[PDB]
Design a protein around this ligand. Structure first.
Ligand SMILES: Brc1ccc(Oc2c(Br)cc(Br)cc2Br)c(Br)c1
Length: 1182
């Protein structure tokens, strides 16, 4: 919404840049004017053949006489015109170079200036300016927005004035050579803009419907794939498939309805568009039979107007490119023009010599850019004498740290003054102020250069002698010399990550080369290892006694030798003096001392599409007809101008022109009929395999075991995304692109035959010319992508040192040396700048070449069409036909290159969708194999079970585990922590087979047992019961599948689970909808319902996995009251974390490190004293 003045945007254009744009926009207009003139001469050549075409047929008496005056007219005329086109092609060769080159030159020259000015402005901003913005957005603003500015001021402007030249020059020749047809062509323009407007309404409305249509099926898939361990547990894998299949049926029916309406839309759209043209051209014929215009002029105005009319649409993108470049330049120039109060690049203020270093703070009130929300200093008074070292202590707020911020004049105070020596700090130069102040901060930062270079960021003029003394005087010498490469080592976020105390001494040595008169040490010893602390602390004490120093730290070890100590309380200075005095004061300081002591040939996807042997053959056959039907309009247009250039006697002409125009409209309605079919046939054929694919995928997905859905590569969202994209992409490959690619090869094929059999030696010429300009048009775009990628590679090296500069900013400004990054960024941009200059000559040559190879090509189309061919017996009416036929047949092949990525994007999406079906699990629930035992009673053997989760085969959970529980008993299971309690339930449910050992139930190994039958006698109840969006009657009936459960049977379960209090209380009762879609209710109810569906199954084994996990107060007392009633009649395994409710259990088992450690009844394990009795006495007292 915000934008920029048009002159301010080019503020960096001066002298030559202003000329480049003037000469560029001049030749751009000349380039645009050239095309409607190119068509103007196309009318005069018709009149040349027309005068001869009328007189040649008018004879029917003399033949040799027509070999004289006729050919004489032709050679003087045709050579005059052919001489003119060759001049036009030489003209466009020059102006197209001038157009693109100069604008890209002015762009590159300015964008170099933008960059430098804009990075200059970033470094000039005071700190308070950064505290209110994000530096990451700013850096992306540096590389992206400057690119948008370059796109707007570039060669797009020349293309704009080129298009307006074609537009103006278009209707000028349109108006002057005839004012009627133009008003007639503009009269049909609202109809064309109205038919395309029906598309903006149908698309935007129907694209939402399908995104709502599958959103109903994708919603089913998401609550399933999220609740997968529950559907696997109860074996609803046939229902959840069935229910996803039922939504696919509706999405198919909505997809075929969209296919019907959208194809009616296209066909009716074109048929209105092509009828609009034909009426404007038929009523061009109605004006020639009346002797107002010539057959050549009708062509001249008919093309020049449509060229200029379409030139409007070809200029619209360049308008938006210029407008976005303006809007992008607002926030950029806003930074450049913004002037700070502090600068730090300003050459102003005093520069005192012989600085003794007497500092005082007077009545300083201050607040960080959070402003009126918080005021961190409520007045202040503090002096520090020259040579002394004051220490600042404080409990919180870190107002200690604020004084270091103010001393560097990072911010100015609200009220008060900070005074170095006697002068106010605001009188001294900002840069010289920071050169007389050395800073060592908590987190040391080192730039991505050598050790010497980081030390060289203290002062630019320095020799390895002074680096050596600095690191040796900050005892960091002995510790780099052992490190290889000497001073020439590397440091940064990338490579040679060092010790913190090691990085701090390099910072101290960096601050030591600064030979400052003032020293600020903030938290430097804090957040650092204890032993290297003393090593750095020796350097700090050696960094002083030649300087006055303010130090802030939470280490009360460094503070004793400070000449004076100062404490803060609420921004107010309170205590000050020597250590002994503050201890006698017994205040804040004393109080803190005591406290701290694969693209491949995939045919099978089409073999699955072979389910419909018809529907393609209908569409293919119907597409090839539409392909062969499409040049016939060019054949008609050829003969409409042909027989009426080849007229002769004029009485018969008016009667044939009506016959052809009638044929055209019968030929368009039969084109509507054949294109309503080819779209419907593939549309239906695509929507039906969309179901088959999504059906078979969602079927195969429910087939893998829990080992596959635990994969971090496979989550619920990534699976629904993989489910939706892969099915829609393969639909597009077999969809419109294939009908169109066969329509177009039939378009050119039926066009090449007519042209080849109409023009001898002629078609063979064009087939030598057209492929060259097409390949020359492709090699340009490859060179375009190469130059684009290369410039991206070498400007990110500039933005990389700009990234280091701006998000490490508060350190560099503390070290000054902004001019250093200022220059480094300039040297980095000098390569893309001198590269951007070559870009202009490259784009200019390539563009001018492809334009000349088009004009020169069409000079050879006529010079050969006339002369050698027309001195022979071949005719003009066919030359016009071969042009339209070949040129449209080629431009229809241009759609093949546009649909190319739709194939690769689908094959890659197909690549995954064939793999996802064929992948088979280790534990397949679909296998009908298995024993299906007949005996009822239930035991459970775990014997020497060692288990590791397939996702994390590092720390074992089960190793040598052994259990046994009799029928009708409750097996309590206690653990120190982890899923060692829960993995038992997962292995009995056979979510996994164990690595070693085995688990049995009725004496039979479950590994050889039926997987589905096994899970059918299991009453799993988890800690967060997931309930699908449906009637609670079904959420309860979900516990028994392969059969519909009675109402009074799901009532009995609701009676058991003690949930029946709601189930009558609701207005809907058992038919209420739950799932946070129709109704919401708390967890205790969700849980009871899970108990209800658990014992609908009438299991012989309950599995209670921390059922009272998320639950509170009386809700625990009633759910336990339901669980305690559910067991005791069944085999039970309960791992609930309430050991008070576990006391009444037939056998309690303590799990240690995967091994069974301690088992027995409650009082038996309570008589023993160990883990269980520690587990029961850790929560009874707490
Ligand atoms: Br119908 C018909 C279509 C294209 C024809 O030649 C061209 C060609 Br070839 C290129 C361009 Br741009 C414009 C025209 Br008009 C002719 Br002549 C007749």
């Amino acid at each position: 919404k915000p934008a920029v003045s048009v002159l301010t945007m080019f503020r960096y254009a001066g002298w030559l840049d202003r000329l480049y744009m003037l000469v560029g926009t001049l030749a751009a207009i000349i380039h645009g004017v050239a095309l409607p003139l190119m068509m103007l001469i196309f009318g005069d050549m018709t009149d040349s053949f027309a005068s001869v075409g009328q007189v040649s047929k008018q004879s029917t008496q003399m033949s040799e006489a027509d070999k004289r005056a006729m050919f004489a007219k032709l050679e003087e005329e045709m050579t005059t015109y052919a001489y003119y086109y060759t001049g036009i092609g030489a003209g466009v060769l020059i102006v197209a170079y001038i157009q693109v080159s100069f604008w890209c030159l002015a762009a590159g020259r300015q964008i170099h200036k933008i960059r430098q000015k804009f990075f200059h402005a970033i470094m000039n901003q005071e700190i308070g300016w950064f505290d209110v913005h994000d530096v990451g957005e700013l850096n992306t603003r540096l590389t992206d927005d400057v690119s948008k500015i370059n796109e707007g001021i570039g060669d797009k402007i020349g293309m704009f004035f080129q298009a307006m030249a074609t537009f103006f020059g278009g209707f000028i020749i349109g108006f002057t050579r005839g004012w009627k047809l133009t008003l007639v062509i503009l009269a049909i323009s609202p109809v064309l803009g109205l038919s395309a407007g029906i598309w903006a309404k149908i698309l935007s409305s129907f694209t939402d419907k399908e995104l709502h249509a599958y959103a109903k099926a994708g919603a089913v898939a998401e609550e399933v794939l999220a609740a997968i361990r529950t559907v696997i547990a109860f074996g609803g894998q046939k229902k959840e498939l069935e229910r996803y299949n039922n939504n696919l049926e509706e999405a198919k029916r909505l997809g075929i309805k969209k296919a019907i309406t959208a194809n009616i839309s296209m066909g009716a759209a074109f048929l209105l568009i092509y009828a609009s043209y034909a009426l404007a051209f038929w009523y061009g014929t109605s004006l020639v039979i009346s002797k107002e215009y010539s057959i050549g002029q009708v062509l001249t105005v008919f093309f020049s107007v449509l060229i200029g009319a379409f030139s409007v649409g070809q200029a619209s993108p360049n308008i938006e490119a210029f407008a976005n470049a303006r809007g992008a330049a607002y926030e950029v120039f806003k930074i450049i023009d913004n002037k700070p109060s502090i600068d730090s690049f300003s050459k102003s203020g005093h520069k005192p010599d012989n600085i003794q270093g007497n500092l005082e703070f007077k009545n300083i009130h201050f607040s960080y850019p959070s402003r009126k929300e918080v005021q961190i200093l409520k007045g202040l008074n503090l002096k520090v004498k020259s040579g002394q070292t004051v220490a600042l202590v404080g409990n919180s707020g870190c107002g200690k740290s604020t004084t270091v911020q103010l001393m560097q004049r990072l911010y100015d105070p609200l009220d008060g003054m900070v005074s170095i020596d006697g002068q106010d700090i605001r009188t001294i130069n900002v840069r010289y102020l920071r050169e007389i102040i050395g800073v060592v901060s908590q987190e040391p930062v080192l730039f991505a250069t050598t050790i010497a270079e980081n030390i060289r960021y203290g002062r630019e003029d320095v020799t390895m002698d002074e680096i050596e003394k600095a690191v040796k005087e900050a005892n960091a010498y002995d510790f780099i010399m052992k490190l290889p490469h000497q001073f020439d080592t590397l440091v940064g976020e990338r490579g040679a990550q060092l010790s913190g105390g090691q990085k701090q001494r390099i910072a101290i040595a960096r601050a030591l080369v600064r030979n400052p008169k003032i020293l600020l040490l903030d938290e430097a010893t804090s957040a650092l290892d204890t032993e290297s602390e003393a090593v750095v602390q020796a350097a700090l004490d050696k960094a002083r006694e030649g300087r006055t120093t303010i130090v802030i730290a939470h280490r009360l070890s460094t503070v004793r030798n400070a000449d004076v100590i100062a404490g803060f309380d609420g921004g107010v200075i309170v205590e000050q003096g020597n250590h002994d005095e503050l201890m006698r004061e017994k205040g804040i300081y004393f109080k803190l001392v005591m406290t701290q002591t694969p693209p491949a040939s995939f045919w099978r996807i089409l073999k699955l599409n072979s389910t419909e042997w018809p529907y393609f053959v209908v569409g293919i056959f119907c597409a090839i007809i539409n392909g062969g039907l499409q040049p016939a309009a060019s054949v008609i247009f050829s003969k409409v101008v042909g027989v009426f250039t080849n007229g002769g006697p004029p009485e018969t002409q008016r009667q044939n022109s009506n016959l052809f125009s009638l044929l055209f409209l019968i030929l368009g309605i039969i084109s509507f009929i054949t294109f309503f079919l080819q779209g419907f046939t593939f549309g239906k054929a695509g929507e039906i395999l969309t179901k088959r694919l999504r059906y078979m995928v969602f079927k195969s997905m429910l087939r893998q075991d829990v080992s596959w859905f635990d994969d971090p590569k496979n989550t619920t969202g990534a699976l629904t995304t993989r489910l939706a994209n892969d099915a829609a992409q393969v639909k597009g490959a077999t969809g419109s692109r294939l009908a169109v690619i066969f329509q177009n090869i039939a378009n050119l094929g039926t066009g090449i035959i007519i042209s080849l059999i109409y023009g001898w030696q002629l078609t063979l010429l064009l087939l030598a010319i057209v492929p060259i300009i097409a390949i020359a048009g492709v090699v340009e775009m490859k060179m375009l992508s190469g130059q684009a990628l290369k410039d991206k590679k070498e400007l990110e090296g500039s933005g990389k040192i700009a990234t280091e500069a701006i998000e490490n900013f508060r350190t560099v400004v503390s070290l000054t040396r902004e001019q250093k990054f200022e220059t480094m960024y300039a040297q980095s941009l000098q390569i893309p700048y001198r590269n951007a200059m070559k870009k202009a000559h490259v784009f200019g040559i390539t563009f001018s070449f492809t334009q000349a190879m088009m004009y020169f090509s069409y000079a050879a189309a006529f010079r050969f069409g006339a002369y050698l061919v027309t001195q022979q017996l071949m005719t003009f009416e066919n030359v016009l036909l071969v042009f339209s036929a070949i040129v449209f047949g080629a431009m229809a092949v241009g759609q093949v290159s546009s649909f190319a990525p739709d194939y690769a994007k689908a094959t890659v999406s197909a690549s995954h969708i064939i793999r996802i079906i064929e992948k088979t699990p280790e534990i397949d629930s679909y296998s009908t194999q298995g024993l299906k035992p007949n005996m009822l009673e239930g035991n459970v053997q775990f014997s020497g079970v060692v288990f590791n989760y397939p996702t994390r085969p590092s720390i074992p959970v089960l190793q040598g585990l052994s259990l046994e529980v009799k029928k009708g008993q409750t097996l309590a299971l206690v653990g120190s922590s982890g899923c060692g309690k829960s993995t038992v339930v997962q292995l009995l449910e056979r979510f996994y087979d164990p690595m070693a050992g085995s688990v049995f139930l009725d004496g039979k190994e479950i590994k050889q047992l039926n997987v589905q039958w096994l899970r059918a006698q299991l009453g799993i109840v988890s800690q967060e019961p997931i309930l699908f969006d449906c009637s609670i009657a079904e959420n309860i009936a979900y516990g028994d599948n392969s059969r519909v459960v009675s109402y009074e049977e799901i009532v009995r379960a609701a009676k058991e689970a003690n949930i029946h209090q709601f189930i009558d209380s609701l207005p809907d009762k058992y038919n209420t909808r739950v799932g946070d879609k129709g109704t919401q209710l708390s967890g205790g109810q969700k849980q009871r319902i899970a108990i209800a569906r658990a014992l609908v199954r009438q299991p012989h084994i309950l599995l209670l996995d921390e059922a009272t996990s998320a639950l509170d107060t009386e809700s625990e007392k009633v759910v336990q009251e339901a669980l305690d009633k559910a067991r005791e009649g069944r085999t039970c395994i309960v791992i609930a974390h309430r050991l008070s409710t576990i006391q009444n259990a037939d056998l309690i088992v303590v799990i240690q490190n995967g091994k069974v450690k301690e088992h027995g009844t409650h009082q038996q394990l309570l008589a023993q004293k160990g883990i269980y009795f520690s587990m029961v006495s850790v929560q009874a007292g707490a």
